[PDB]
Amino acid sequence: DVYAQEKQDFVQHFSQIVRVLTEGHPEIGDAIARLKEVLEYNAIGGKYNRGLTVVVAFRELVEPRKQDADSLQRAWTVGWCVELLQAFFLVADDIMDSSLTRRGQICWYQKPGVGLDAINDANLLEACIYRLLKLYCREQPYYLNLIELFLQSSYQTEIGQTLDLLTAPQNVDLVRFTEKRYKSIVKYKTAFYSFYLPIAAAMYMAGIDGEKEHANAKKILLEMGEFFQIQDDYLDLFGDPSVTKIGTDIQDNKCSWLVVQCLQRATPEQYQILKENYGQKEAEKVARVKALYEELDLPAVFLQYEEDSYSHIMALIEQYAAPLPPAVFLGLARKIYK
Amino acid sequence: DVYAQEKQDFVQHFSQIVRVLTEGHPEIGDAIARLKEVLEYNAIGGKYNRGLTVVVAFRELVEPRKQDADSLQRAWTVGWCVELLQAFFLVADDIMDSSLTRRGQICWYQKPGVGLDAINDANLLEACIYRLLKLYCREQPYYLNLIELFLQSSYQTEIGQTLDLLTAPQNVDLVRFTEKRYKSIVKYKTAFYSFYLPIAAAMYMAGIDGEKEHANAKKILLEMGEFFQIQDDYLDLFGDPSVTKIGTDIQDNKCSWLVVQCLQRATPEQYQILKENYGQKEAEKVARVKALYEELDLPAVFLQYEEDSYSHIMALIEQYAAPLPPAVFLGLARKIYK
Ligand SMILES: O=P(O)(O)C(Nc1cncc(-c2ccc(OC3CC3)cc2)c1)P(=O)(O)O
Ligand SMILES: O=P(O)(O)C(Nc1cncc(-c2ccc(OC3CC3)cc2)c1)P(=O)(O)O
Numbered sequence: 001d002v003y004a005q006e007k008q009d010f011v012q013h014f015s016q017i018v019r020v021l022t023e024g025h026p027e028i029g030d031a032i033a034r035l036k037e038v039l040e041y042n043a044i045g046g047k048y049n050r051g052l053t054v055v056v057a058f059r060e061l062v063e064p065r066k067q068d069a070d071s072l073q074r075a076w077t078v079g080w081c082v083e084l085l086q087a088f089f090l091v092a093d094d095i096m097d098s099s100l101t102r103r104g105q106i107c108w109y110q111k112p113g114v115g116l117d118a119i120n121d122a123n124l125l126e127a128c129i130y131r132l133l134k135l136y137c138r139e140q141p142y143y144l145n146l147i148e149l150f151l152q153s154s155y156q157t158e159i160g161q162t163l164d165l166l167t168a169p170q171n172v173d174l175v176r177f178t179e180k181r182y183k184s185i186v187k188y189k190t191a192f193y194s195f196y197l198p199i200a201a202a203m204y205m206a207g208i209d210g211e212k213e214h215a216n217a218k219k220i221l222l223e224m225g226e227f228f229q230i231q232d233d234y235l236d237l238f239g240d241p242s243v244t245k246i247g248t249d250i251q252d253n254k255c256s257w258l259v260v261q262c263l264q265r266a267t268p269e270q271y272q273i274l275k276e277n278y279g280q281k282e283a284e285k286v287a288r289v290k291a292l293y294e295e296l297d298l299p300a301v302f303l304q305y306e307e308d309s310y311s312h313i314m315a316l317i318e319q320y321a322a323p324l325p326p327a328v329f330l331g332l333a334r335k336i337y338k
Numbered sequence: 339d340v341y342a343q344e345k346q347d348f349v350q351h352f353s354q355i356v357r358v359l360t361e362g363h364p365e366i367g368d369a370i371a372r373l374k375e376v377l378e379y380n381a382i383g384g385k386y387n388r389g390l391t392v393v394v395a396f397r398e399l400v401e402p403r404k405q406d407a408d409s410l411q412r413a414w415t416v417g418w419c420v421e422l423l424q425a426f427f428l429v430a431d432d433i434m435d436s437s438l439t440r441r442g443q444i445c446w447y448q449k450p451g452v453g454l455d456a457i458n459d460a461n462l463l464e465a466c467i468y469r470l471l472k473l474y475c476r477e478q479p480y481y482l483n484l485i486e487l488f489l490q491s492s493y494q495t496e497i498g499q500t501l502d503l504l505t506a507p508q509n510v511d512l513v514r515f516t517e518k519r520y521k522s523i524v525k526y527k528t529a530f531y532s533f534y535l536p537i538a539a540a541m542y543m544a545g546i547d548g549e550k551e552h553a554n555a556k557k558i559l560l561e562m563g564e565f566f567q568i569q570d571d572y573l574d575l576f577g578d579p580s581v582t583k584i585g586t587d588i589q590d591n592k593c594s595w596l597v598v599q600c601l602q603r604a605t606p607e608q609y610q611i612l613k614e615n616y617g618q619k620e621a622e623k624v625a626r627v628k629a630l631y632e633e634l635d636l637p638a639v640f641l642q643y644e645e646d647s648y649s650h651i652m653a654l655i656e657q658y659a660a661p662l663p664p665a666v667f668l669g670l671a672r673k674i675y676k
Contacts, residue, residue, distance in 0.1 A: 031497050143482075158458055158462050
């Protein structure tokens with residue numbers, strides 16, 4: 001509810017984000033209208049967890065007497081920058097994976113009269129981050145630190161995307177689905193921008209700019225990010241859609257935690273069943289896969305992993321949170337846990 | 339030849355650009371190999387005019403006693419950053435336009451086993467700019483100015499791309515091909531990153547960071563950029579491939595200077611011929627278009643435009659070059675003129 005409290009004013013701020021990004025240069029009006037449409041379609045409709053973490057962390061990291069009106073405008077804005085980063089990645093990712101829907105809406109690129117123009121639209125969303133940072137934060141001591149953090153985050157995510165694309169050519173081979181490779185993908189592709197970025201942005205805005213402090217936060221948050229993606233992979237199969245969307249990882253030939261662990265623990269005659277069934281449109285095949293996972297006690301393996309993980313994270317928060325308040329980590333953990 | 343003199347050491351520096359961008363983190367090796375391939379395929383093979391302008395301008399803007407070894411490493415590097423910016427735009431543009439070749443080579447996205455993964459590859463090329471700037475320029479006083487210049491340049495180009503895409507839906511309507519719209523596209527899509535960016539980067543590296551100075555340079559260079567794109571449109575039709583590639587603007591339904599001027603100067607019965615012929619795969623139609631341009635004395639209109647343009651540019655260089663040496667502009671002009 002620390003998140004539920006901030007959410008009202010966060011989403012309300014979006015209206016202003018859009019105003020300023022379309023606010024002189026009359027010749028480009030039509031392009032700016034297109035920009036407006038891209039923002040409204042792509043940046044709105046999710047949970048906004050990543051953005052909100054910026055604002056919640058800011059509240060927990062700054063003396064309450066130094067949380068003036070301006071400071072809060074800036075914290076909302078950087079939060080919206082995180083959401084724009086995410087929109088950039090997802091618009092582009094949806095093209096690369098030939099996805100149909102995102103958030104139960106037709107993917108932007110699939111809207112008629114959009115198509116591959118969405119590539120430029122994604123790029124504009126990335127541009128908007130640095131426009132906002134300039135408009136709201138150029139005079140601040142942390143300005144350069146945020147620019148570099150956003151850029152570093154894009155690069156990390158892109159490297160991760162490269163690994164994903166090398167790992168599952170859309171021509172998939174299960175020999176490539178290893179744990180070391182699974183961990184790298186999650187780390188570079190999701191954990192950095194999802195878990196490290198928002199807290200880091202908040203750290204910098206509160207004057208916490210030390211390498212060791214950042215290294216400590218990053219150690220905790222990367223492991224949080226690892227856990228939560230593995231949790232998403234599991235829920236994709238063994239969840240209920242009410243609890244979670246509907247799961248399609250198997251028919252999609254994904255390098256999912258489930259498949260990875262399956263491969264580690266199998267006699268030679270179980271690879272040559274999974275080969276047979278993994279990635280097929282038909283549903284009798286998708287059931288064979290689930291039933292194999294079930295026969296391999298992968299819930300149990302998950303449960304054991306969930307325990308080791310909770311323990312290790314709490315230990316890390318004990319060691320490395322200081323001098324940040326532990327509730328910064330603990331809150332995010334509680335909030336993402338599904 | 340001021341360009342021909344710098345070219346040897348510029349292209350040689352590329353080897354180092356690639357070394358440092360693939361130079362600790364063993365888990366991502368395969369992604370870094372992919373990065374190596376993307377750089378070598380996409381950043382190499384052009385004339386390198388934009389990159390080289392950075393180096394040539396640097397030589398003309400800095401006291402020769404302050405052109406130490408390090409300074410030259412940095413000037414080569416920022417030049418290569420300009421070339422990487424261009425690779426980013428062209429890789430992505432080739433996808434959006436469904437292009438086949440670029441520089442008589444198969445477009446990157448058309449290479450088998452690449453496809454729409456090229457979207458991420460383009461993004462990596464953009465990432466590499468800010469990696470290089472950090473590796474070579476983080477300690478310099480102009481560091482932030484360059485970061486912002488590259489980002490501003492991406493945004494401008496992307497806005498321009500949006501206008502192009504709105505102007506010629508790949509569903510083209512000639513009513514949209516206006517001069518005011520033609521000028522905006524060229525300005526935002528090509529002139530800023532091609533003409534303003536490289537000189538500006540050089541200005542900043544030489545300590546010339548004043549708004550008025552930049553405004554003055556930009557006034558000259560944007561008009562240079564306008565002229566040279568209009569020159570490219572003309573040559574596309576009325577050139578010889580030896581002088582120039584082969585021209586395909588007409589069958590491609592392009593908002594080209596030629597078509598634009600055609601529309602301004604036509605009786606109602608000439609729109610309804612151009613409607614008929616513009617954008618058709620067949621070659622008897624493409625000849626009708628050329629013959630119409632010829633009948634409209636568009637060479638003459640070009641010639642008249644070339645004269646007015648040379649005069650105005652020289653006048654601008656007279657007024658606004660100072661305190662930059664006029665040879666900075668004049669050289670670029672001479673070098674780009676085809
Ligand atoms: O509620 P669940 O059914 O999911 C139970 N799991 C549970 C109960 N209480 C705490 C956790 C927990 C919380 C956070 C965790 O990781 C985040 C700190 C990164 C990991 C596990 C997990 P279980 O699956 O063991 O029956
Ligand atoms: O050599 P060309 O045949 O192209 C001759 N043109 C020509 C001759 N001398 C100088 C120019 C000139 C150079 C630079 C120009 O613009 C650059 C400063 C931006 C414009 C025109 C153009 P023309 O077409 O008039 O017979």
